[PDB]
Amino acid sequence: MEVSVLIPAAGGPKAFLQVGGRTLLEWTLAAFRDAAEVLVALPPGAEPPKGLGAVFLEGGATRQASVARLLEAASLPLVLVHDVARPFVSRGLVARVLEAAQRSGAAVPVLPVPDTLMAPEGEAYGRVVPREAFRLVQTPQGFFTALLREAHAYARRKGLEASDDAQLVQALGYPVALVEGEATAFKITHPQDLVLAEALARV
Amino acid sequence: MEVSVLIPAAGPKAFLQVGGRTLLEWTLAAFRDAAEVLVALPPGAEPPKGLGAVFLEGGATRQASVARLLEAASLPLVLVHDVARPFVSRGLVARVLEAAQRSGAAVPVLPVPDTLMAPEGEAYGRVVPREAFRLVQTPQGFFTALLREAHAYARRKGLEASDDAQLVQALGYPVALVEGEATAFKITHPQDLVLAEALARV
């Protein structure tokens, strides 16, 4: 009913972090349950859970390496790549990313920067920059599978490592379109992120 | 606390409902133990009847509303807070206040949580190192006389800035940083409400 989803979850393992009666992995698998194919990377030695609708492989040392591994196994001409630390991604966000990726070949959800944006002078406080000029980049990021393969191939040759797939595609000279992200699709990174995640999980 | 709390809720937004309470009521509960609470509201907006805050007309901008509230602030320490950040814990308030008392000017900051990118057009564009940057919240805490001087000097110079720390900085006075809170996000867009009303439940 949709198409090809890559989950580079090889960062115990982050994929098995419990958030309100579902692991992170279980949360993303629910968000993409309409996808034709879900491929998940797990750290070597970590045992894939039984009976979920997904194919598992061993991830590399970096998210990027895990994506490349997953990508080789992708069977469909369109891919969504998603951070497992973003459990609360809505069906609306997915469809919006996918829809734009189908047309444009590369599409990323973004949010405006909500707060004054400041660079500490060690101290700090420090130097403020116009938050209106900047965005917070989220996932899923959507691509033609063939394009993301080209991006990863060129990155391998150049030794380019970047924090997301959009940056690899950009290095090809390929335009990456932006769509509206969502406040609920926040990344669980720090201890207070986890606590806030338990609140949204109940509803 | 002791301690003037200024809520520049002007520059209706204050009356936005989030769970059981309006945004204003969330803020008043967060600063329930402050000796003096001053709230700015848009002209024509009528204050609710038994909240124990003191109300003044706000200005055209949030900064101008803070400047108006500072006229009336009578305690030697001041916290200034965005009414659109309802979920401010007690620990956060005490962190900011404590650091204000120690150094005279302090703000809460969060790490930038996502890849930080400057669009080129409507297209992806330039990525900057997020670890070098912070998100600034609120409350911001100061010796009242310093914030008053910072506002006077800004008005004199025509300086307009997105928070109070930048005004104090323009005086050449150091501003300390403390740890913020993920829950102290600003409600700006209709989907922030989504996140808020879920947090409101607990």
Query: Whose CA is closest to B163, among B105, B111, B114?
Result: B105
Q: Cα separation of A113 and A126, whole Å?
A: 18
Contact in structure between B61 and B41 (CB atoms under 8 Å): no
Q: How far apart are the first and last CA of chain A?
A: 26
Quick check: B174 contacting A, CB < 8 Å?
yes
The alpha-helical segments, DSSP class H, found in A43-140 are 63-73, 91-104
Query: Whose CA is closest to B195, among B27, B12, B19, B24?
Result: B19
Task: Give the method used.
Answer: X-ray
Distance of CA A38 to the CA centre of its chain: 13
Q: Which residues contact A156 (CB under 8 A, 6 or more apart)?
A: A68
Q: In Å, what resolution does this model reach?
A: 2.2
A112-141 burial string, b = 16+ CB within 10 Å, else e?
ebbbbbbeeeeebbbebbebeebbbbbbbb
Element (H, E) at B177: strand B176-179
B1-202: which CATH number, 3.90.550.10, 3.40.50.300, 3.40.50.20, 3.40.50.970? 3.90.550.10
**Residue A181: φ, ψ to 5°:** -80, -155
| Chain A residue nearest residue B137, CA to CA | A115
Cβ under 8 Å to B: A residues 133-172:
133-138, 162-164, 166-167, 170
A161 C-beta neighbours (distance < 10 Å), count = 12
Residues from chain A that touch B113, judged by Cβ atoms under 8 A, are: 136, 186-187, 189, 193
Residues from chain B that touch A129, judged by Cβ atoms under 8 A, are: 133
Q: Which residues contact B57 (CB under 8 A, 6 or more apart)?
A: B10, B40, B41, B42, B43, B68
Q: How far is CA A159 from CA A112, A143, B123, B130, in A?
A: 31, 21, 24, 21
Q: Do A119 and B134 touch (CB under 8 A)?
A: yes
Place of tokens 């204000």: B100
According to DSSP, residue B61 is labeled S
Q: Which residues contact B111 (CB under 8 A, 6 or more apart)?
A: A189, A190, B130, B131, B134, B135
A87 C-beta neighbours (distance < 10 Å), count = 27
Q: Do A117 and B136 touch (CB under 8 A)?
A: yes
Residues from chain B that touch A20, judged by Cβ atoms under 8 A, are: none
Quick check: A113 contacting B, CB < 8 Å?
yes
A104 C-beta neighbours (distance < 10 Å), count = 18
**CATH superfamily to which A1-203 belongs:** Spore Coat Polysaccharide Biosynthesis Protein SpsA; Chain A (3.90.550.10)
Contact in structure between A148 and A70 (CB atoms under 8 Å): no
Contact in structure between B27 and B83 (CB atoms under 8 Å): yes
Quick check: B185 contacting A, CB < 8 Å?
yes
Query: Whose CA is closest to A128, among B56, B76, B97, B135?
Result: B135
Q: Cα separation of A175 and A163, whole Å?
A: 17
